[PDB]
């Protein structure tokens, strides 16, 4: 279910079949023209749409344009060369901008920023001042 | 990968999460500020390092912070 | 011989200005109060809060190089 | 004299400069008729030039072997007109501007919109302030030994370092 | 501590307004908030922000 | 002419390298608690004075030395 | 009827209220200043009318009235010049002997010893030598008196006030609607037939009746005084038939279709006037007549209110091939709903035109007594090369402003625009190669010559004595133009220019024109020209094609036209915006045009310009050093830049000493630019904080907080000083060099 | 070149070169083992600095030695 497009030279490279490639799925109620992140234009097909891209940003940039410009909503996948797929956006079905009970704290310092140690204190260690 | 740390001066106004172009940050439950929510950096390996999150943070000084780290193909931002 | 000496003086003061400012603001400034956390050499702090090109203490050295070459010249 | 310099009225090379500067304008004057505008302009230029050499001769300046006037800034009082007297003059006008400009910023500071009065000058107020800097060495001295010239150390923001 | 409308001095070192004065607007009575005090300022910082949250031990009162 | 300009250009690199390593010291070697109120710590405590005054001298030499040359031209 | 007039009455009230509120035009700046950045934003955004309102009608009204203001400043400029020519010039003394009297229309006041700038020019007059060619242009019009220049100056002031009034009238009183502006077919018919067609007809009318007979008497040797008033040429046919004996027929051979009776004034002789060294006025009168018939006929190609004619829309939409897909569909909405897309064409055309104009005025000199004034020839040529250079890149800037703001994907499915964006990696990578191919070859020819010569091996250099690189294609074309009079153009008496070969024209002992032979030193330089244009196009083209997105930044169009970067991740994002592509390409245009004017100034001085004596002994200005001194960089550095500098550096104490001061002044400004271009903002803002402290310590600080110049702005400052200092240093070097050899 | 023109101009250019090399027959048999990328922000300053420096010193050495030895007085 790929959208209507005449092709372009700004698509995927070897990295796709050798390193991870990304696909994005969305559902549209009607046929409308949208801008390609690597290409100028394309007509989306009513029903489910499937697009393959080369970067997570390119996929997420299309989502942003699909969101506040068309009122529609999508899923990102990471595809490996062997065939294993990963589910990325949204992580738990709920968007990262909205709090969801069940999420946890990652990478949080429990103090303000002026409270980091001097670099001379962590001398000859394999760390850094912001990892204490 | 890059390192993104989140300090306690975070007032939980979700503006860093809305600015991230590669889905690195998210909002989680927290009981230390009015909004009862703090930013979190669960996927720092998609972090490209563009610092859009810090341009969006209203606190002084910043609550979110990006530190340069070893570069992979993902943080280099390569399409090849 | 009097005018050239004051030019040579100007060269020494500006070169010193860039090197002394780079050493004293190496640990932090108003625009970046946690500079010591990023080390001696780094690109910048992004285009946030105005923009921050050439903020590292390494950048002061790079800017001073032009003055040494100019005041020895 | 000082540095082996000679006064300009007694310098053989300063006198040669005067002659050659006049000769150059006379050889340009000969190509014009006597009543016309280019002949009256060059005649006025040679008067201005001749008065420039006469002025220096009695000036009391020092010349070198190059024939040009030199200036002495050791602090000798005999060569005061060269640096001291125009120096005291500049200090009076430069310190007048800095004092008056500072009075303005301090005046419009206590206000709703101080920034509005820096792009759009309150001229009646500014005009008043500009002429109050005629006695600045007395006004800058009253505020030094009052406490209103320099602020305290706990009022200036400082970089994280110190 | 301060009240609403009190004029304080910032004692945070990495703040833009360290050693600078400004006016308390709201103090959160709930002590679970770590930085309960909204303090407003008339001059902006480098990000053109006019206010910030502080703790009670980071502000001094002027009179 | 080769000798005098050889040692003056090398003197410039050495001088610039001294301040460059002086900055590196502050970033990853200076310990603030070890030099409380020290002669070294006090230099950071009035760093704005040194910089602002070095800036004045430079502006003064630049304005007058450049202005005098242009007046003569 | 589809073409009508729609005007809104009393649209905007005229009051001094907004004058007292700077920044009223935009939503963010109207709050007032908080930092000093506000002052800079005030100016950068003042003419950006697109970002002030959302209505296309309100943008169009602002543009229309601003055109009246631009023209009113041009009329004031023209009225000044004529005024200076009437009260501060030596026009009369020049008219009597235009071979010995130098030109001048400026006089300086004597106040600080600066009177020395009034040169001894001649005719009992002292002033600054001007090189604009006002004098030569006045002679060709048949001026001859200062009274006539005074009327042009009064008429220029009246026209200037009429423009000022029209711009105020059309913005406040009679503001025309959006429907009026969107009439392309009407507008084209009026500009072709009315502005260009009637302009050439009336001008031709002035040339036949006033300019032709006065020039004939000036050329024969009649003093200006004995020449009658211009209006007397309009009344007595007796005076007109003595000079051109076909006025006895009157106007009857025009309506009988016997136009060959007028071969007295409608010539096709070619060449130049042996007396003045300019083009034959009789050829120029025929030139404007043939133009004006062409322009008036061309202004009937579009359909307005009567059925007949072409609609621009059905033309473009018919052009579609099997490689182009939809072809030109959509280019109407584009070019009738966006002002940026229009300038992108227009500035590219007008800039190309000014380059074209400069190439045709040195080879076929149209004014009399101008070809031997080498200061005017050199000044006028470079000027149009610079104005052409800036306008060309300015077209590429608006092409990229269009892609960011006015471009929409839904309006362009599968058309030529959509398709270029689809293979944009292929246009850029192929161009990239052509650039690496042209640079290694054209510039490597010079390196080879530099090392071969230094190693003592001149037998192996690319030269006219070693391995020749003869430009055989351009030499072949020259022969065609030389043999053209009689054969290909059977009614032409002489060649269009004497550059293609022919005879040597001389006025007053100086050479006006000569054949310009092309050898291998020519050939090598033409590739440098090729090469620097291809690189300039590589930066500007890339900026337009990647204005909306790239593999690096997929959402570049959301960031805008001019942003500094997208941060220090993804490696380096500095200068990714399409504004920064315009910024880089400005340095190339500079590089390209500098080599053009260097090539022109040296080739003319080596192989054309000079004096002569008995038996045609030509002595050139630099003595023919062009074939064996420009093939190496050392030769360009030592014989062009070092040798010809002697004037500007030894100009002190003379009347051209202002050129020596501006020479140094522009070397200073150029170096001053490098402080802005090599550094960046966060070193400067920390520097300001220590300065602000010294003010705070003394109880005072400005309430408008001092902030360093922004990233984008610090680049635009360094570029403006780089151009000013660079172009200026050359300006001073060119005039003091050419005034001494003219 | 390294001091005025910055990085994200160059990064975008190389992406078209990586594309071209991957699409041309007979050049497709060869391939890099390290992804070609544009020099970084701090690397461009150091390189641009080394050129400005080495060019600065070599052209003065050239001048001062031969102007003295070519005139010998
Ligand atoms: C370029 C060089 C330059 C120079 C030479 C000056 C010179 C001057 N500036 Mg300006 N200025 C400059 C550049 C310069 N400026 C620049 C770049 C700026 C930044 C934009 C300014 C900004 C500026 C401001 C805002 C002001 C000046 C003012 C002044 C004047 C202060 C001294 C004075 O008023 O007279 C000397 C006056 C006296 C000595 C009077 C003495 C006092 C009285 C009471 C004694 C009376 C004696 C009596 C009358 C004698 C008669 C006795 C009889 C028997 C003979 C002075 C004329 C001030 C001014 O214009 O004054 C209103 C002022 O407000 N300047
Ligand atoms: C010729 C080129 C040039 C010039 C003129 C300057 C000028 C300056 N640079 Mg520099 N800079 C340059 C190249 C140059 N730069 C390059 C290539 C680099 C490498 C990127 C730098 C990097 C750099 C840095 C890092 C620093 C400087 C600093 C300075 C300032 C030194 C203080 C001074 O001299 O005051 C005199 C001012 C001038 C000479 C500017 C010209 C002013 C003219 C108009 C005055 C005219 C004379 C007279 C006063 C006329 C009277 C005025 C009238 C109204 C009465 C000054 C603004 C330092 C600084 O800003 O400290 C204050 C500083 O930290 N620059
Ligand atoms: C625009 C083209 C142009 C240019 C570049 C010149 C240039 C020149 N003219 Mg000229 N002139 C022109 C057009 C031009 N003119 C026209 C159209 C006329 C006929 C009206 C004249 C009539 C004329 C005469 C009669 C003379 C000149 C002279 C001169 C020279 C000295 C001018 C001078 O220093 O006055 C100095 C001017 C001032 C000090 C006025 C100060 C202006 C400031 C205050 C700007 C004010 C703007 C203000 C802030 C805006 C507020 C807006 C609000 C009021 C609404 C100079 C080379 C003189 C000359 O050549 O001597 C031999 C001379 O005698 N001109
Ligand atoms: C005895 C003197 C001495 C010593 C021991 C050091 C030692 C050190 N310095 Mg140092 N430095 C010195 C003098 C010294 N420097 C001087 C004189 C300067 C002024 C120029 C500097 C400026 C300086 C800076 C700015 C930095 C150091 C750094 C360092 C550290 C790592 C160096 C490194 O990785 O190099 C790696 C080696 C190279 C990159 C090779 C570079 C070769 C250069 C580019 C020249 C090559 C050009 C070539 C000659 C051109 C040929 C021309 C031909 C075609 C004609 C190390 C502790 C760095 C650091 O990380 O410290 C924490 C750092 O940032 N130093
Ligand atoms: C025959 C009719 C005619 C003529 C001569 C023009 C001429 C012009 N138009 Mg125009 N226009 C026309 C019809 C015409 N238009 C119509 C019908 C429309 C609506 C579709 C427009 C819409 C339009 C727009 C939207 C714009 C123009 C602009 C311009 C100017 C282009 C700039 C230039 O080359 O300056 C050359 C300048 C001159 C030759 C000086 C002439 C000055 C006045 C106008 C004299 C002309 C009046 C009259 C014919 C003279 C009679 C001579 C007398 C001896 C008999 C130019 C003055 C642009 C401009 O600058 O606007 C101000 C612009 O933005 N036109
Ligand atoms: C567009 C500008 C223009 C203008 C205003 C004039 C104006 C004039 N021309 Mg004319 N003319 C023009 C262009 C122009 N011409 C061109 C372009 C050519 C060459 C193709 C001529 C060739 C020409 C000749 C050969 C003669 C005139 C004559 C005249 C005069 C009387 C014509 C008359 O009353 O006929 C009546 C008006 C109409 C029928 C309308 C009049 C001054 C005559 C003249 O000089 O008389 C003294 C005359 O014999 N013209
Ligand atoms: C017919 C010509 C034309 C027109 C109408 C425009 C119109 C516009 N351009 Mg544009 N442009 C042009 C030609 C033109 N340009 C050319 C030739 C170039 C290439 C150089 C550009 C490059 C360009 C860029 C790169 C940008 C624009 C922008 C803009 C827009 C806002 C401009 C503004 O507010 O500036 C206000 C005007 C000024 C601030 C004046 C400053 C001009 C310089 C610095 C001074 C000139 C020096 C002086 C001549 C000599 C000094 C001597 C010294 C001794 C004093 C506006 C739509 C900007 C935009 O946002 O687009 C929407 C933008 O980013 N243009
Ligand atoms: C003298 C200074 C200089 C030089 C040599 C260059 C060189 C180049 N620039 Mg430029 N650039 C400069 C200043 C300079 N720049 C400045 C000041 C700026 C700031 C505005 C820029 C901004 C800039 C941009 C923005 C762009 C360039 C581009 C280019 C490239 C043009 C392609 C080409 O022909 O390369 C060929 C190399 C040469 C012409 C120089 C050397 C020729 C050699 C001698 C012949 C072949 C040698 C051989 C390959 C190796 C053998 C020698 C070795 C074994 C020792 C080239 C690498 C463009 C580019 O990459 O497009 C392709 C481009 O887009 N530059
Ligand atoms: C030059 C070649 C040329 O003129 O071909 C002309 C060729 C004609 O294409 P079409 O017949 O599809 O064009 C029909 C309409 O677009 C005409 O307006 O244009 C191309 O195919 C573009 C190919 C790019 C050429 C690569 C360089
Ligand atoms: C010097 C410099 C500054 C400092 C320059 C500033 C702060 C602008 C100062 C402009 C003044 C305030 C305008 C008035 C000009 C002078 C007061 C008068 C000089 C004109 C003479 C002819 C008198 C930057 O902010 C900057 C930012 C980004 C990249 C490079 C640089 C940079 O190189
Ligand atoms: S550095 Fe950039 S990509 Fe990473 S979290 Fe911040 S905004 Fe997102
Ligand atoms: S880090 Fe900043 S943007 Fe993110 S939630 Fe906290 S205050 Fe908001
Ligand atoms: S533009 Fe400045 S702040 Fe942004 S990435 Fe480049 S150097 Fe860093």
mmCIF file of C-alpha atoms in Angstrom, chain C residues 23-49:
data_model
loop_
_atom_site.group_PDB
_atom_site.id
_atom_site.type_symbol
_atom_site.label_atom_id
_atom_site.label_comp_id
_atom_site.label_asym_id
_atom_site.label_seq_id
_atom_site.Cartn_x
_atom_site.Cartn_y
_atom_site.Cartn_z
ATOM 1 C CA UNK C 23 41.875 31.407 30.889
ATOM 2 C CA UNK C 24 39.674 33.224 33.403
ATOM 3 C CA UNK C 25 36.356 32.395 31.712
ATOM 4 C CA UNK C 26 37.425 28.798 31.084
ATOM 5 C CA UNK C 27 35.408 27.458 34.025
ATOM 6 C CA UNK C 28 32.232 29.423 33.316
ATOM 7 C CA UNK C 29 30.462 32.651 32.426
ATOM 8 C CA UNK C 30 27.007 34.225 32.447
ATOM 9 C CA UNK C 31 26.257 32.638 29.083
ATOM 10 C CA UNK C 32 27.485 29.226 30.224
ATOM 11 C CA UNK C 33 27.826 28.726 33.969
ATOM 12 C CA UNK C 34 28.793 25.058 33.699
ATOM 13 C CA UNK C 35 31.563 25.347 31.117
ATOM 14 C CA UNK C 36 33.991 23.195 33.120
ATOM 15 C CA UNK C 37 31.648 20.241 32.570
ATOM 16 C CA UNK C 38 32.326 20.248 28.826
ATOM 17 C CA UNK C 39 36.107 20.462 29.038
ATOM 18 C CA UNK C 40 38.683 22.601 27.268
ATOM 19 C CA UNK C 41 37.671 22.118 23.651
ATOM 20 C CA UNK C 42 34.159 21.730 22.262
ATOM 21 C CA UNK C 43 32.193 23.115 19.277
ATOM 22 C CA UNK C 44 29.613 25.354 20.931
ATOM 23 C CA UNK C 45 26.484 25.252 23.056
ATOM 24 C CA UNK C 46 24.095 25.377 20.116
ATOM 25 C CA UNK C 47 22.050 28.324 18.790
ATOM 26 C CA UNK C 48 20.036 28.574 22.008
ATOM 27 C CA UNK C 49 19.784 31.666 24.234
#
